[PDB]
Write an enzyme that holds these catalytic residues in place. Structure first.
Site, PDB file in Angstrom:
ATOM      1  N   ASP A   1      -7.743 -14.495  -7.412  1.00 24.52           N
ATOM      2  CA  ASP A   1      -8.459 -15.777  -7.341  1.00 24.52           C
ATOM      3  C   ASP A   1      -8.905 -16.079  -8.784  1.00 24.52           C
ATOM      4  O   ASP A   1      -8.872 -15.180  -9.623  1.00 24.52           O
ATOM      5  CB  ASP A   1      -9.704 -15.688  -6.419  1.00 24.52           C
ATOM      6  CG  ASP A   1     -10.451 -17.003  -6.208  1.00 24.52           C
ATOM      7  OD1 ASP A   1      -9.826 -18.082  -6.382  1.00 24.52           O
ATOM      8  OD2 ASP A   1     -11.664 -16.955  -5.887  1.00 24.52           O
TER       9      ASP A   1
ATOM     10  N   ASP B   1     -12.120 -18.328  -9.752  1.00 26.39           N
ATOM     11  CA  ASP B   1     -13.585 -18.280  -9.767  1.00 26.39           C
ATOM     12  C   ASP B   1     -14.121 -16.980  -9.172  1.00 26.39           C
ATOM     13  O   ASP B   1     -13.777 -16.641  -8.040  1.00 26.39           O
ATOM     14  CB  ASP B   1     -14.178 -19.512  -9.076  1.00 26.39           C
ATOM     15  CG  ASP B   1     -15.553 -19.888  -9.604  1.00 26.39           C
ATOM     16  OD1 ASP B   1     -15.685 -20.094 -10.831  1.00 26.39           O
ATOM     17  OD2 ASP B   1     -16.488 -19.994  -8.793  1.00 26.39           O
TER      18      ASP B   1
ATOM     19  N   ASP C   1       4.637  -9.084 -47.842  1.00 23.73           N
ATOM     20  CA  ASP C   1       5.752  -8.609 -48.661  1.00 23.73           C
ATOM     21  C   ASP C   1       6.299  -9.732 -49.566  1.00 23.73           C
ATOM     22  O   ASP C   1       5.497 -10.352 -50.271  1.00 23.73           O
ATOM     23  CB  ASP C   1       6.813  -7.921 -47.754  1.00 23.73           C
ATOM     24  CG  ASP C   1       7.942  -7.307 -48.528  1.00 23.73           C
ATOM     25  OD1 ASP C   1       7.719  -6.266 -49.163  1.00 23.73           O
ATOM     26  OD2 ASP C   1       9.006  -7.942 -48.615  1.00 23.73           O
TER      27      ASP C   1
ATOM     28  N   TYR D   1      15.393 -10.508 -54.634  1.00 21.37           N
ATOM     29  CA  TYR D   1      15.172  -9.482 -55.673  1.00 21.37           C
ATOM     30  C   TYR D   1      15.977  -9.722 -56.964  1.00 21.37           C
ATOM     31  O   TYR D   1      15.759  -9.024 -57.958  1.00 21.37           O
ATOM     32  CB  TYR D   1      15.653  -8.113 -55.121  1.00 21.37           C
ATOM     33  CG  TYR D   1      14.788  -7.481 -54.061  1.00 21.37           C
ATOM     34  CD1 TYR D   1      13.683  -6.707 -54.406  1.00 21.37           C
ATOM     35  CD2 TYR D   1      15.101  -7.609 -52.707  1.00 21.37           C
ATOM     36  CE1 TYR D   1      12.914  -6.071 -53.433  1.00 21.37           C
ATOM     37  CE2 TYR D   1      14.341  -6.976 -51.726  1.00 21.37           C
ATOM     38  CZ  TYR D   1      13.262  -6.186 -52.096  1.00 21.37           C
ATOM     39  OH  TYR D   1      12.478  -5.600 -51.139  1.00 21.37           O
TER      40      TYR D   1
ATOM     41  N   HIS E   1       3.765   0.052 -44.527  1.00 21.48           N
ATOM     42  CA  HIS E   1       4.308  -1.198 -45.065  1.00 21.48           C
ATOM     43  C   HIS E   1       4.413  -2.347 -44.057  1.00 21.48           C
ATOM     44  O   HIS E   1       4.258  -3.512 -44.440  1.00 21.48           O
ATOM     45  CB  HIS E   1       5.692  -0.964 -45.723  1.00 21.48           C
ATOM     46  CG  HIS E   1       6.264  -2.220 -46.310  1.00 21.48           C
ATOM     47  ND1 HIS E   1       5.679  -2.824 -47.413  1.00 21.48           N
ATOM     48  CD2 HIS E   1       7.260  -3.022 -45.846  1.00 21.48           C
ATOM     49  CE1 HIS E   1       6.345  -3.955 -47.595  1.00 21.48           C
ATOM     50  NE2 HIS E   1       7.318  -4.107 -46.688  1.00 21.48           N
TER      51      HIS E   1
HETATM   52  C1  LIG Z   1      13.900  -0.394 -48.363  1.00 31.99           C
HETATM   53  O1  LIG Z   1      13.300  -1.391 -47.540  1.00 31.99           O
HETATM   54  C2  LIG Z   1      12.331  -2.079 -48.257  1.00 31.99           C
HETATM   55  C3  LIG Z   1      11.780  -3.181 -47.634  1.00 31.99           C
HETATM   56  C4  LIG Z   1      10.802  -3.907 -48.282  1.00 31.99           C
HETATM   57  C5  LIG Z   1      10.382  -3.541 -49.544  1.00 31.99           C
HETATM   58  N1  LIG Z   1       9.371  -4.315 -50.157  1.00 31.99           N
HETATM   59  C6  LIG Z   1       9.394  -4.779 -51.460  1.00 31.99           C
HETATM   60  O2  LIG Z   1      10.261  -4.515 -52.279  1.00 31.99           O
HETATM   61  N2  LIG Z   1       8.294  -5.577 -51.712  1.00 31.99           N
HETATM   62  C7  LIG Z   1       8.085  -6.361 -52.865  1.00 31.99           C
HETATM   63  C8  LIG Z   1       8.052  -7.738 -52.756  1.00 31.99           C
HETATM   64  C9  LIG Z   1       7.812  -8.514 -53.874  1.00 31.99           C
HETATM   65  C10 LIG Z   1       7.601  -7.923 -55.105  1.00 31.99           C
HETATM   66  C11 LIG Z   1       7.605  -6.546 -55.225  1.00 31.99           C
HETATM   67  C12 LIG Z   1       7.376  -5.864 -56.489  1.00 31.99           C
HETATM   68  N3  LIG Z   1       7.798  -4.567 -56.622  1.00 31.99           N
HETATM   69  C13 LIG Z   1       7.521  -4.222 -57.855  1.00 31.99           C
HETATM   70  N4  LIG Z   1       6.912  -5.238 -58.526  1.00 31.99           N
HETATM   71  C14 LIG Z   1       6.624  -5.104 -59.952  1.00 31.99           C
HETATM   72  C15 LIG Z   1       5.202  -5.308 -60.428  1.00 31.99           C
HETATM   73  C16 LIG Z   1       5.223  -5.706 -61.883  1.00 31.99           C
HETATM   74  C17 LIG Z   1       4.312  -4.737 -62.581  1.00 31.99           C
HETATM   75  C18 LIG Z   1       3.661  -3.946 -61.477  1.00 31.99           C
HETATM   76  O3  LIG Z   1       4.458  -4.102 -60.306  1.00 31.99           O
HETATM   77  C19 LIG Z   1       6.821  -6.320 -57.680  1.00 31.99           C
HETATM   78  C20 LIG Z   1       6.207  -7.539 -58.091  1.00 31.99           C
HETATM   79  N5  LIG Z   1       6.883  -8.588 -58.512  1.00 31.99           N
HETATM   80  C21 LIG Z   1       6.024  -9.579 -58.923  1.00 31.99           C
HETATM   81  C22 LIG Z   1       6.325 -10.833 -59.441  1.00 31.99           C
HETATM   82  N6  LIG Z   1       7.641 -11.288 -59.569  1.00 31.99           N
HETATM   83  N7  LIG Z   1       5.312 -11.632 -59.804  1.00 31.99           N
HETATM   84  C23 LIG Z   1       4.062 -11.179 -59.661  1.00 31.99           C
HETATM   85  N8  LIG Z   1       3.645 -10.004 -59.178  1.00 31.99           N
HETATM   86  C24 LIG Z   1       4.685  -9.242 -58.834  1.00 31.99           C
HETATM   87  S1  LIG Z   1       4.494  -7.674 -58.168  1.00 31.99           S
HETATM   88  C25 LIG Z   1       7.850  -5.778 -54.096  1.00 31.99           C
HETATM   89  C26 LIG Z   1      10.921  -2.425 -50.156  1.00 31.99           C
HETATM   90  C27 LIG Z   1      11.902  -1.695 -49.517  1.00 31.99           C
END
Ligand SMILES: COc1ccc(NC(=O)Nc2cccc(-c3ncn(C[C@@H]4CCCO4)c3-c3nc4c(N)ncnc4s3)c2)cc1
Ligand SMILES: COc1ccc(NC(=O)Nc2cccc(-c3ncn(C[C@@H]4CCCO4)c3-c3nc4c(N)ncnc4s3)c2)cc1
Lengths: 546, 546
Positions: free
Chosen positions: B8, B10, B334, B465, B523
């Site tokens: 029900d 209420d 991410d 990437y 993650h």
């Molecule tokens: C294997 O399966 C996976 C699935 C997901 C991931 N995840 C990632 O790779 N995440 C991710 C996403 C975006 C940027 C980054 C990242 N990974 C390393 N850095 C480098 C920085 C620079 C100095 C300190 O770390 C960045 C970043 N890229 C940037 C950017 N292009 N602009 C601003 N901040 C960051 S941080 C990582 C990894 C393995």
């Protein structure tokens, strides 16, 4: 030779100019003339304002720097700034007061209609103020009407730097002599002129448009009232909801705010609301324009009973459930108008407000069969023609372009004479094979309806008329009810099928009913009189639906 | 033998019972005991209340009739009703105070999870009051969790009439001995019992659930905290927007209120937000869960540069333009979290508020190449593996089920060891061919990701990437800016790729930054700790985003 028109934002497409508020402030606070304008341009190409206009800093980072320049200027001028002097307050008010310059927008719209490429070129900033949405809303309304929007803070260049003019020319894919450039700042006009562009210094709009008309050879001033903005199907957000295993509903969605569900008639489309969709979204509503069951991209099952009001309404309630909407305002035209009255009667908790174009609400007669009522009025003979499955489908599907061109006609355009349709053997027996195009529609708009109807034809749409008995039985359950939620009834003077007098007793069952009435308007309300439909609907939504 | 549970509304699924307010009112106004309850049931099967419950009249038509019965009852009892006595006020307050009985809903949810058919059977009314939305919202929240909702006012039958019980049995496609029926009214329970159904008289919830547990043999009391409601892909509204000639973006949409744009990461889907979508919509938001460019039903062009941050952001701004949204709150995880920080920096006027799960904001180094930074940290070796077009695509596409089962793992489930990925020759070289299923996902949820990735594979996703240099150059233009709009940074303790310490200096560029932190979270934030993600996001949205 001219084929592109470029417009500045401040002082050209939007008024009053945000820049002119520095002068007004000096006058209102009795500060030395030019004090604020001088602090604003302080440092010139290396100053705080150029950094802001290039996108190096945001508007909120710029505010303290402008304040420091204001202090420096007042010191030199040997004056004191008032006790509660605030650059933030001044700019918040200036930005909020700035509105679209409607005649300038109309001129840009006309030039684009005549084949010109149009662009907005503006020295602007990255706005991160708490009140930034107002400006975001304005830029959205304006930008949709242009081919390009070039903002200094996004391109990292500023007028009067020559690079921004070369960037504009590259964006336009035009040579300077092919471009009209309109600006309120003479200094920002100089590099366009030096390049060989036609330039217009804009002070008052009327003079600027006289110069624009003279140079383009296009009538822009004293022109007739334009139609509201329409929809380009490929530019809309298209939504799809499965309401049951074999039934999915398609809709077009635009805007934010209270949900407004538009329900078309027979034999139509979501596109029948094309002039209402942008206007209602601009008025602050989230528009959901349906393809009703049997039409366009919505499913069209063949069974007659899939189109009875009880099932159609149940599905519209499921549609709301799946979208996570507790309510919507329901606005219908023709068969859509019939459905919306039924939604108000059976599901008032889900209906925020209800409005119908042309379709009246007539309570069921518990003593008379619905078919008896149709036979009693000669105007409704076409409905008996629509009864036998296959007959009307064959005629309406034979030549789609002919069907829509014959149907979609204004009151003065020799619309189908619907007396003795059965006797004559069809709707188009006294109609030309190649009808003329109504003033209400373009050839392209007819071809949109033709393309939509190629998918499912007329079976599902005609099935809306094939549930007289079922609908009557269901409507009888509502005989003791009244519609007490906000309701609007819009009559069309020259609709000879859904005549205004058919709605005359509605107040007996809808005591607080509000009305609208459109003169010299035929059956196809939305496209016949779009400006007036928009005016009536927006006024009622703002007063009665939120 | 038991396979269906009927509840029900209420006094069973919603408390306090609207009916119990008649008693509270009598006590509060010192009226004769039972006076209001007697006026409510006046006339019995032929009275005003039965007509209301059968759908003959609406709640607003019933209000004056209840008032007349109240006058008649007070006359007979030789008492006077107070000066400002209002049935409308009393019912408005009672309906508004009635909330979902969470442990009863949890029990229904568990029974349905174990294969029971569940239904709500209720004596209710057609609500046309100005405040009807509150009840509409409640019925929506409740109904989604059940197979059937049977309302007296829609079926034209009322409990305790035997016809409604035969109608329930026909709807359930079950014999009476197969049904548990829970009701707070003993009289309404009697016909179900007389038919042979198992019946539970509900007074206090705990006792009712003890009886329910005993009779079903299913643990319903003291059970672990359940997961938030998830999404069934086929039950969602699916939206599609063309942002440019070869690029369309797909999204799932639910709820009303401020627009909340959810941006997933790599290699994910809109479905990664499945536990957040219902919760955020229920919290009063219009959720737009994207398939980011390169994924699911969104377009996946092959070119690397189609996936640089500048183009991805420009497209998300176009997405807002085409939907007619001046702003949205942007929430990313991410790579989605990276994009949302860029949206805040480049388009603050379009970003209502910004929130990132795991992804920190790190300003570009104008002196160092982005590839140099990646090479300096051993954890980011997999990113160099992702660089060469084709290499990672071949490995990730080889066996889709293996890819997602290896990737989607909780912190304690032996997640991929990403050191020396290039040296090893791949991500899954030390991984089993047939990974075990993570506690975070079902086999069916893995097959959803597998099906989505069959369309475009990993080229577009990996291309996110492949724009290090392009993104670095664009990010350098923002070096002098600060993020001054509302911002939330959510860190995940055990994310070993996007470590919490990587976000430590964010306050230097985002001074008013708010934070959230999730312990024992890897993650895959949304599916690892959905209850906590929902709690952090809803709290921040209500305080900072509206
Ligand atoms: C294997 O399966 C996976 C699935 C997901 C991931 N995840 C990632 O790779 N995440 C991710 C996403 C975006 C940027 C980054 C990242 N990974 C390393 N850095 C480098 C920085 C620079 C100095 C300190 O770390 C960045 C970043 N890229 C940037 C950017 N292009 N602009 C601003 N901040 C960051 S941080 C990582 C990894 C393995
Ligand atoms: C040839 O191309 C066209 C295209 C559109 C139309 N439009 C319509 O046929 N509109 C339309 C839509 C819905 C209902 C009606 C309608 N046409 C006649 N009646 C009969 C009433 C009954 C007594 C006085 O007129 C009704 C209505 N049906 C109902 C209903 N089922 N429930 C409540 N009120 C009405 S009014 C007409 C006609 C020809």
């Amino acid at each position: 030779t001219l084929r592109a028109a470029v417009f500045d934002l401040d002082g050209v497409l939007a008024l009053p100019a945000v820049f002119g508020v520095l002068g007004r402030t000096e006058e209102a606070l009795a500060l030395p003339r030019g004090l604020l304008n001088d602090a604003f341009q302080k440092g010139g190409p290396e100053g705080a304002t150029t950094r802001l206009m290039k996108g190096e800093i945001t508007l909120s980072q710029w505010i303290p720097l402008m304040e420091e320049n204001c202090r420096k200027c007042s010191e030199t001028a040997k004056v004191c700034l008032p006790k509660n002097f605030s650059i933030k307050e001044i700019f918040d008010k200036a930005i909020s007061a700035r509105k679209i310059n409607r005649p300038m927008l109309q001129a840009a719209l006309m030039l684009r209609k005549k084949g010109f490429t149009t662009a907005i070129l503006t020295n602007t900033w990255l706005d991160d103020r708490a009140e930034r949405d107002g400006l975001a809303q304005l830029m959205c309304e304006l930008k949709m009407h242009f081919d390009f929007l070039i903002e200094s803070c996004q391109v990292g260049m500023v007028k009067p730097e020559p690079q921004i003019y070369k960037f504009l020319l590259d964006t336009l894919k035009a040579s300077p002599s092919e471009v009209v450039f309109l600006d309120d700042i003479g200094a920002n006009l100089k590099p366009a002129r030096d390049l060989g562009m036609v330039t217009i210094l804009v002070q008052d709009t009327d003079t600027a448009l006289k110069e624009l008309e003279k140079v383009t050879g296009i009538q822009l001033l004293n022109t007739p009232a334009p139609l509201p903005t329409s929809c380009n199907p490929s530019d809309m957000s298209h939504g799809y909801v499965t309401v049951k295993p074999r039934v999915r509903l398609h809709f077009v969605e635009l805007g934010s705010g209270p949900a407004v569900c538009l329900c078309h008639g027979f034999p139509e489309s979501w596109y029948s609301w094309r002039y209402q969709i942008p206007a209602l979204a601009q008025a602050g509503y989230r528009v959901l324009a349906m393809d009703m069951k049997g039409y366009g991209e919505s499913s069209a099952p063949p069974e007659i009973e899939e189109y009875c009001m009880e099932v159609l309404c149940k599905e519209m309630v499921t549609f709301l459930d799946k979208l996570g909407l507790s309510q919507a305002v329901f606005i219908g035209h023709d068969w859509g108008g019939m459905l919306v009255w039924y939604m108000a009667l059976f599901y008032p908790e889900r209906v925020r407000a209800v409005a119908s174009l042309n379709t009246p609400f007539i309570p069921a007669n518990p003593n008379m069969s619905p078919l008896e009522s149709i036979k009693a009025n000669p105007v409704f003979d076409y409905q008996l023609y629509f009864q036998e499955p296959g007959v009307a489908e064959a005629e309406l599907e034979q030549n789609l372009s002919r069907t829509f061109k014959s149907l979609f006609r204004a009151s003065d355009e020799s619309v189908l004479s619907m007396h003795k349709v059965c006797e004559a053997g069809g709707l188009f027996v006294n109609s030309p094979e190649e009808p003329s195009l109504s003033r209400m529609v373009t050839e392209e708009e007819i071809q949109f309806y033709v393309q939509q109807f190629k998918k499912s034809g007329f079976r599902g749409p005609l099935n809306w008329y094939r549930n007289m008995e079922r609908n009557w039985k269901w409507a009888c359950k509502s005989l003791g009810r009244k519609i007490l939620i906000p309701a609007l009834m819009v009559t069309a003077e020259k609709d000879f099928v859904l005549v205004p007098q058919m709605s005359q007793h509605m107040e007996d069952w809808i005591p607080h009913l509000k009305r609208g009435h459109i003169e010299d308007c035929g059956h196809w309300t939305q496209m016949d009189k779009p400006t007036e439909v928009n005016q009536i609907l927006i006024k009622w939504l703002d007063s009665d639906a939120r």
